[PDB]
Amino acid sequence: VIPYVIERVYDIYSRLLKDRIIFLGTPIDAQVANVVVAQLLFLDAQNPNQEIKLYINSPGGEVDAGLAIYDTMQFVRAPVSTIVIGMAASMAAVILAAGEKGRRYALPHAKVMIHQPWGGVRGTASDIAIQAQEILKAKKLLNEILAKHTGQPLEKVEKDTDRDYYLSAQEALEYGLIDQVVTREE
C-alpha cells in the first residue's frame, strides 16, 4: 500500500526521486542493484553537479549486486550523500561508507554492522576450489574497500569483520564509516 501525491501524479518514492532522493530499503540482489543504478544514472544525467541523497535501511545482500551500486556511486559525477535510517549491514554498510566524504550520516539509533561474506559451493572438488577462491577474493576486496573509506588499517578491518561487528551510530562515526550523527533538523 503506497500513497500518492500530485504536482502530475507520483507515488511517494517517485515524488522523492524528483527531489534527488533514492531509497535502498530492501535486501540487495541484482534487481535491487539495477533499479538503484538506474536512478543514480538518471539523476546524474539530469544534473551532474547536484547532490543525490541515498537513504539506507537494509541488511545487505549479494556482493556483486552491492558492488554495482558502489561502483556507480564512485562513477557518477554527482556527489552521493548517504544516510542510514534504521540499519546498514554488510554490503549496505559498505555502501553507506562509500558516500561522499563529509556527507555520510546516521540517525542516532541507527545501526551499522560489518562482517565477512557468506556463500555456498556445491560440485566436484575442482569446482569447489574455483568458487572458494572467488569468495576469498571477495572477502579481501570488501576489507580493502572498507579500509579505504574508513581510513582504518586493513589489518584492523580484517580482524573486526571476522564475525558480526555491530556499531552504534556514534561508534560508526569513530570507526570512520560515517561523518556525522544527525539528531534534529536545522
Tell me the torsion sign for CA atoms 16, 68, 110, 182.
negative
Paired residues of 55 in beta bridges: 23, 83
Catalytic residue among 14, 58, 81, 115: 115
Select 57 or 152, whichever has its Cβ closest to its own copies: 57
Euclidean distance between CA atoms 99 and 178, whole angstroms: 8
| 8 A C-beta contact, residue 113 and residue 93 | yes
| 8 A C-beta contact, residue 115 and residue 167 | no
> What's the N-to-C CA distance of the chain in angstroms?
31
Select 122 or 151, whichever has its Cβ closest to its own copies: 122
Catalytic residue among 58, 90, 109, 126: 90
What are 17's three cell numbers? 526521486
Footprint of its own copies on 89-128 (CB under 8 A) = 107-111, 115-128
90 is catalytic: yes
Footprint of its own copies on 132-171 (CB under 8 A) = 132-136, 138-139, 141, 162-164, 166
Euclidean distance between CA atoms 105 and 180, whole angstroms: 5
Q: Binding marks (x or -) toward its own copies, 23..52, rule CB under 8 A?
A: x-xx---xx-xxx-xxx-xx-xxx-x----
Q: How far is the CB of 154 from its own copies (least distance, A)?
A: 16
User: Which region among 21-29, 95-103, 147-155, 172-180 touches its own copies (by CB under 8 A)?
Assistant: 21-29
Q: How far is the CB of 21 from its own copies (least distance, A)?
A: 8
> Active-site positions?
90, 115
